[PDB]
């Protein structure tokens, strides 16, 4: 999903709000902030109601202006609440009654997702690959800066995981794939407008193809 959450390469932001080894304070800065992750794990591990991928996607589905002005831990409060409503566990009415006011949720999905690809390739370390030039309206673990770009394989994982574009929509056809550390030259991704060396993106097999 080409949403505002896909921030890598966006220009115009200011300084990162940190200097090295500065005090970051406690783990949680307010008494509620442990709740979104805790309740995420309840939903995944105890209820079996959703996957972690569905949590990533529902945060992607926040209305874009809403995403941009919401602090990090609040986005996950909104996202977990939204999944609980969508899955039929809770109602928005009861959330708003308990909250004593408005509790706007993420927007409905505009895509049913897509299955794990049927035709993929097992790549080897040192091989050149291209990121498939595809557009996915639902969930995908491919930042747009690498779409269509060429890099080389630095690692193939020894484990395999469900394809995000399926499991992020709660589908039954996510299969399993390894991922690949794909190293891109900075100039492949941003031309002359970069001061870096290389970027390594961890890409599902189903996002890749042999380079020309």
């Amino acid at each position: 999903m080409d949403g505002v959450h896909d921030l890598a390469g966006v220009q115009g932001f200011g300084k990162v709000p940190h200097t090295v080894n500065a005090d970051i304070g406690p783990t949680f800065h307010a008494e509620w902030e442990h709740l979104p992750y805790s309740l995420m794990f309840a939903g995944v591990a105890e209820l079996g109601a959703f996957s972690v991928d569905e949590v990533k996607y529902v945060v992607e589905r926040m209305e874009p202006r809403h995403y941009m002005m919401t602090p990090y831990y609040e986005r996950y409060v909104i996202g977990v609440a939204t999944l609980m409503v969508e899955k039929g566990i809770l109602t928005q009415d009861e959330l708003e009654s308990l909250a004593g006011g408005p509790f706007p949720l993420s927007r409905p999905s505009e895509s049913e997702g897509r299955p794990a690809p049927v035709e993929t390739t097992t790549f080897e370390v040192g091989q050149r690959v291209r990121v498939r030039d595809e557009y996915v309206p639902g969930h995908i673990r491919m930042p747009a800066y690498c779409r269509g770009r060429v890099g080389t394989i630095s690692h193939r994982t020894t484990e395999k995981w469900p394809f995000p574009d399926a499991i992020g929509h709660g589908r039954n056809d996510a299969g399993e794939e390894p991922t690949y550390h794909v190293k891109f030259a900075a100039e492949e991704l941003f031309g002359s407008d970069t001061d870096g060396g290389s970027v390594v993106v961890d890409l599902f097999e189903g996002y890749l193809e042999p380079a020309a």
């Binding site: 932001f13 709000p17 940190h18 442990h34 609980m84 959330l95």
Partner: protein, 197 residues
Amino acid sequence: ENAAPAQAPVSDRAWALFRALDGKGLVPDGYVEGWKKTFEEDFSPRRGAELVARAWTDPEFRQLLLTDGTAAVAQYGYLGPQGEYIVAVEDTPTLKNVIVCSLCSCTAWPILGLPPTWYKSFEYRARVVREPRKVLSEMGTEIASDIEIRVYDTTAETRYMVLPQRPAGTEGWSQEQLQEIVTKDCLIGVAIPQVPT
């Protein structure tokens, strides 16, 4: 035009989500309190620092950490949620590594701790993959031009830690002494370990 939506206070919303679930018997006794304790006391960059200090003083362990990070971390019992498939990435005289999650916040929780606010900022997420040298400079870390910067974007299930170079002036130090100078920011890759005067 472009206004925020009306919202109850965030604390009220977060505790409303807890109570809605808890009141349906869906949250076990002590469940969120137990996770709070794990997040605050167990998941910690002190663990990654221990791993770095061991690698610096034990060539066999260093090789293991760089080839099968998961196995190395498992020897210490530090695998866990958001930290099941670990890859450690080696700085060298000509390479500086840096970690980000441009899409959200993905981090090797058990051995780095939960991410700091700045790592989850839109500024870091947008800029470090495109202009890491300027970002690090602004944060207080000068990386000379003879050093390639390599940014790892945590886009799938691999969870990373940086193995920084060991600084001069630490020869013969104990693992405990070494650990003390390996900070959270060293593990993320935005800082280099510092040796006092």
